[PDB]
């Protein structure tokens, strides 16, 4: 049920809840927490990042 996504831009974390991302990173989303933020994981670490900074990826064959 986790949704794959790829970062379209760098995202700098400014709070201890946020997950930093580098453009091109593949991340996995658990849920949407509010209008602007997803909660997800990168390399097993959980945090939040912006909806608009990622693209949702299609399923693998």
């Amino acid at each position: 049920e986790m949704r794959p996504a790829r970062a379209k831009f760098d995202f700098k974390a400014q709070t201890l809840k946020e997950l930093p991302l580098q453009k091109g990173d593949i991340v996995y989303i658990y849920k949407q927490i509010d209008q602007n933020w997803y909660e997800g994981e990168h390399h097993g670490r959980v945090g939040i990042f912006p909806r608009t900074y990622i693209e949702l990826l299609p399923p693998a064959e």
């Binding site: 831009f9 709070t15 602007n36 939040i48």
Partner: peptide, 10 residues
């Protein structure tokens, strides 16, 4: 270059 940054959740 990146999209407008959203504020942290309420």
């Amino acid at each position: 270059v990146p999209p407008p940054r959203p504020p942290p959740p309420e």
